[PDB]
Design a protein around this ligand. Structure first.
Ligand SMILES: [Zn+2]
Lengths: 75, 62, 88, 158, 52, 74, 52, 96, 217, 81, 74, 74, 74
């Protein structure tokens, strides 16, 4: 449903862009935006971005420090 | 160029419906999950010293 | 000794047979609980702000439509066509 | 049912259940222990703050009339007594709530810090109280002064 | 180790992180590595019994 | 026509405003050089601040440019 | 062995949480192992004290 | 061949292992990989503009032209500032 | 009735945790005079009850505006915020939320030349917060329209693949302006929600109840 | 061993109330209470008397890739006012 | 007409004012860089002050833009 | 008419003055950043002074805007 | 014609904006000299920052020049 609706939306939007007055301007705006999507795929350090997002939440910025072994030793 | 919409109220109600859905989905779906994951870590980090001391006192093993 | 019954619903080990279903929050369970417990008493300022903007923009749409109606009647009374011709 | 599923019950529900179990006299040692365990350990420690001081006073006199004493439950339910929670009550209701809470705290001999909010709620408006009730409030005030190791002061705006 | 457990996590099976390694961001300390080795030596419970 | 002629005049008077936009941008980048020379150990951070200010000040530029298009083709 | 079950259950549960938290631990396994902690955190979220 | 799994693996080996910067030997001409990404960005924009103009080139431009003309049209519908004039001239041009 | 299972440590959860904790840190709670203990805990909970949910509201507006702003930079899509009534409705709604909060603090009805001047500059927040988002989303888009029109005008008239340096320069400028549009999109969502925090937090001050009776020493 | 396969078992899923958001946006787009963007409500006598080509007007049918800006797909009614 | 033609001229002369708005905004962001370089331990706070001033100074910008719309479409 | 046309021209020339108002406001907020970086222990007080100056300088802005309304609708 | 005549007038009023662009560029290069004299051990880095600011401020110049071409040949 997601990819069918996305392709449906892209075809509907491209058909509406072609019927517009400066239609070729819109069709090359699509190229201008897809170029920066392609450049984002190349430029972004995705591992550094993942580990930087891990530092935004305090639950993943640190190791879970809680119960120690020496307090819970059973004998 | 398009400046003025066909309906200002329909577009403002679209903004209100989208922001109210984002508010509901934040408060109801995202924030409970975020607070569970955050507050487990935060409660263990805030309670590590007192918890280990109380468990050390209650432990008869030593 | 301390048996299972002393930690029956308090402490459980990691599951060994199957992974359970996730425990829902009360807001995920019910929209009425979220509406009466958090949405109204904490977010009624936002709800009133959205209500104010929808009301004000309905007023502005009424002003725009009354201006269009006045220009339409002024064109009809003057014997002019109210709009100009289309391109085709 | 409450004793079997005490971990699943909320303080918001247990106060309403204990009020009915207090209305007519009905109690068990296991029921009082499970309600106290559920309010103290199975629920949030700020749940008496969201309770309303009349329900906490009813639960306190329930545990006082049954003679069952739990110091941890006493600390937890004592945390709910405040200037905010007693200020939400009407004056005729606040009189009964303050008197019953002070009677329960004097029965148990437990004097937390938050009893300053209860005794103060009597001494800010002493005109509604009788002379007998003012005498019992002064007795609880003297006992709480000795237990907390200081002198009770009324605090004005500053 | 923590980086080894991160490598087996679903997020390093996602498309943008298939070829990345968790050791490249923060490398494991040698106490972590020798602790992983020492824990691997003790996953046999009989060996842990005999050692203790 | 008088209308399209005044559209050209109003477009030129509209894009007058890029002068003060470029002047403020030059002042900001000169202060970027001064801040990087005063304390270079945060210079990368300062560059980020500069680009932040740059984008925000260029918003004013596009504001003026919007008016030019609203005179030229609207 | 009088209270060994409670101490070893505490050790087992926290050991599994600390091994898997922030990497691949499901929220269902968290809510299964510690239902009362999840109940208290859900009380905080319900009573508009999520930033407490 | 599962329809999406093979597509995922093929796109993965195109995305990661295939690199035209190395296979065409562009380190000789270019200083960086990021300079190649910038040049490939503007080259993608230029290739897209040229194929969108080549897909339909005889049309009258909606965008304002800089006093110019395509090839030998000169005074045809393609070089008409008046769009109603260009539509009626397009019909006579289409007659052939 | 069955909720989905969530992995701990997911990238959307971590990003949204950092975003919410950023917007919550904009209007922090006031440190009380007394040491916070079980005596002061109901006053602290009551003070949190009096405070508005500006963290949740700012996170809502930040997410819903950075999504609509980044929609305009996706191919075949336009920004909903580039429409006038959408962005200005978000701005007028934020101003009305702050005004309704301030009216609820003062008793639900509205308060020489100083009173008109400051009321005009306060009422201009309603216009300004939405219009500064709307014309900024119209900004790089309409400049992009006109510039890619001239970028089409060069090879339409000089040949499809000839005079590549001039069209190369114009396409470099176009690429730089779409990147600037990305920066302006993220930054305008951020500026909107910073301003929503500072507008709603003007009326976020209620007095601490505190202890009316203590036992000193 | 990990929980990775357990999370790989779950497919793609929409956000939990996305049907309400779609059904709010669509209901705002279809409950306008006004005609549909270049149409006009007419009498039933006119609507049954008018053919299909005269009901269509050329501004609401622009050409997909127009060789001249302003080309329309239909010519509308040949009868002109 | 003379009216719509003068509307274009008055719109351009109206959006002249974005020059000084952008100049003051550039001055403020340059002083943001200078203040962050002088004492970075409060730099985040300074950024907040800058954005505060930014919003307030851009109010003047929208004031001018309001007049442009009052000339163009009012 | 010539009158309403010149009303549009005079309105644009009237709201020219927001340029120098925004420039002075940007200068004042930049000096707010500089003063907060020089001595932050009074920074809150400085912000109050800044807002004081802001309101007073924006009085000049509304003065110019008053003239725009006196040309447009008076 | 009145149209091409007003195109020349609007082109001149359009390229007015290069004044403030050159003024900001001169301010930035003067601060480059001041920063290189204050701390020359990072001077090469400062030159890079200057050229960065130069290109960005020039963008405003080409913006104005774009409008000149949009008046002259569009
Ligand atoms: Zn577009």
């Amino acid at each position: 449903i997601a990819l069918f609706g996305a392709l449906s939306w892209i075809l509907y939007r491209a058909d509406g862009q072609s019927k517009a007055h400066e239609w070729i301007v819109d069709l090359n705006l699509n190229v201008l935006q897809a170029a920066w999507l392609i450049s984002f795929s190349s430029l972004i350090p995705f591992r550094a971005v993942y580990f930087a997002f891990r530092g935004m939440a305090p639950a993943t910025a640190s190791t879970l420090n809680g119960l120690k072994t020496f307090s819970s030793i059973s004998l | 160029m398009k400046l003025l919409p066909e309906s200002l109220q329909q577009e403002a109600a679209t903004a209100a419906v989208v922001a109210s859905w984002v508010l509901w989905h934040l408060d109801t779906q995202l924030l409970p999950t975020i607070m569970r994951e955050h507050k487990l870590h935060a409660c263990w980090a805030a309670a590590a010293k007192r918890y280990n001391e109380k468990l050390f006192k209650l432990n008869p093993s030593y | 000794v301390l048996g299972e019954v002393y930690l029956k619903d308090i402490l459980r080990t990691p599951p060994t047979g199957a992974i359970p279903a996730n425990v829902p929050h009360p807001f995920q369970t019910s929209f009425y609980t979220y509406a009466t417990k958090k949405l109204i008493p904490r977010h009624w300022y936002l709800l009133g702000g959205f209500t104010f903007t929808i009301t004000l923009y309905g007023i502005l749409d009424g002003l725009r439509d009354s201006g269009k109606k006045k220009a339409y009647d002024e064109a009809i009374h003057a014997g002019k066509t109210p709009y100009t011709a289309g391109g085709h | 049912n409450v004793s079997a599923n005490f971990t699943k019950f909320e303080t918001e529900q247990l106060l309403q259940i204990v009020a009915t179990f207090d209305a007519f006299n009905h109690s068990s040692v296991a029921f009082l222990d499970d309600v106290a365990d559920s309010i103290t350990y199975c629920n949030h420690y700020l749940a008496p703050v969201r309770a309303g001081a009349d329900e906490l006073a009813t639960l306190l006199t329930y545990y006082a009339k049954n003679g069952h004493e739990r110091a941890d439950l006493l600390a937890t339910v004592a945390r709910g007594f405040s200037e905010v929670s007693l200020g939400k009550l009407s004056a005729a209701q606040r009189k009964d709530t303050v008197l019953s809470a002070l009677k329960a705290f004097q029965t148990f001999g437990f004097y937390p810090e938050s009893i300053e909010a209860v005794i103060g709620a009597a001494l800010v408006s002493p005109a509604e109280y009788s002379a007998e009730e003012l005498k019992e409030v002064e007795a609880v005030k003297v006992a709480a002064e000795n237990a907390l190791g200081g002198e009770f002061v009324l605090i004005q705006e500053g | 180790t923590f980086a080894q457990r991160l490598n087996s996590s679903p997020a390093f099976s996602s498309f943008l992180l298939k070829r990345e390694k968790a050791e490249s961001e923060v490398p494991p300390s040698e106490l972590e590595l020798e602790a992983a080795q020492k824990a691997a030596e003790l996953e046999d419970p009989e060996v842990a019994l005999r050692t203790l | 026509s008088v209308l399209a002629a005044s559209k050209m005049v109003g477009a030129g008077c509209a894009t007058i405003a890029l002068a003060g936009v470029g002047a403020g941008l030059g002042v900001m980048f000169g202060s970027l050089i001064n801040g990087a020379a005063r304390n270079p150990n945060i210079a990368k951070q300062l560059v980020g601040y500069a680009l932040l200010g740059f984008a925000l000040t260029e918003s004013i530029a596009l504001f003026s440019l919007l008016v030019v298009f609203l005179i030229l083709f609207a | 062995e009088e209270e060994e079950l409670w101490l070893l259950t505490l050790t087992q549960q926290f050991k599994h949480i600390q091994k898997h938290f922030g990497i691949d631990l499901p929220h269902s396994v968290v809510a299964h192992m510690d239902p009362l902690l999840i109940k208290k955190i859900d009380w905080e979220t319900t009573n508009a004290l999520e930033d407490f | 061949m599962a329809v999406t799994s093979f597509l995922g693996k093929a796109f993965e080996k195109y995305f990661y292992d295939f690199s035209a910067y190395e296979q065409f030997g562009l380190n000789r001409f270019l200083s960086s990989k990021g300079q190649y990404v910038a040049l490939r960005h503007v080259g993608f924009v230029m290739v897209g503009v040229n194929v969108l103009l080549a897909a339909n080139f005889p049309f009258n431009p909606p965008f304002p032209t800089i006093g110019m003309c395509p090839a030998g049209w000169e005074g045809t519908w393609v070089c008409q500032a008046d769009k109603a004039k260009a539509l009626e001239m397009y019909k006579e041009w289409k007659k052939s | 009735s069955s909720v989905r299972d969530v992995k701990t440590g997911s990238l959307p959860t971590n990003f949204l945790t950092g975003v919410y904790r950023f917007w919550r840190s904009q209007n922090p709670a006031e440190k009380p005079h007394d040491p916070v203990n079980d005596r002061l805990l109901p006053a602290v909970v009551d003070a949190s009850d009096k405070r508005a949910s500006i963290g949740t509201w700012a996170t809502t507006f930040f997410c819903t505006i950075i999504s609509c702003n980044l929609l305009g930079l996706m191919p075949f899509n336009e920004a909903p915020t580039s429409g006038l009534g959408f962005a200005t409705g978000l701005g007028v709604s934020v101003w009305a939320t702050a005004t309704i909060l301030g009216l609820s603090k003062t008793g639900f009805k509205f308060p020489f030349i100083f009173v008109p001047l400051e009321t005009i500059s306060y009422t201009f927040r309603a216009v300004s917060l939405g219009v500064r988002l709307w014309v900024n989303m119209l900004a790089g888009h309409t400049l992009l329209h006109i510039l890619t029109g001239m970028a089409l005008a060069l090879p339409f008239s000089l040949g499809f693949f000839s005079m590549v340096p001039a069209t190369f320069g114009v396409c470099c400028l176009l690429s730089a302006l779409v990147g600037l549009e990305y920066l302006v999109a993220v930054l305008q969502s951020g500026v909107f929600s910073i301003l929503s925090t500072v507008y709603v937090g003007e009326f976020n001050h209620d007095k601490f109840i505190g202890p009316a009776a203590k036992i000193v020493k | 061993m990990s929980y990775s396969a357990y999370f790989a078992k779950a497919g793609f899923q929409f956000p939990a109330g996305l049907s309400a958001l779609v059904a709010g946006i669509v209901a705002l787009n279809v409950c306008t209470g006004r005609p549909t963007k270049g149409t006009k409500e007419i009498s039933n006598a006119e609507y049954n008397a008018t053919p299909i080509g005269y009901l269509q007007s050329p501004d609401q049918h622009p050409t997909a890739f127009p060789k001249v800006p302003g080309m329309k797909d239909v010519h509308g009614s040949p009868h002109h006012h």
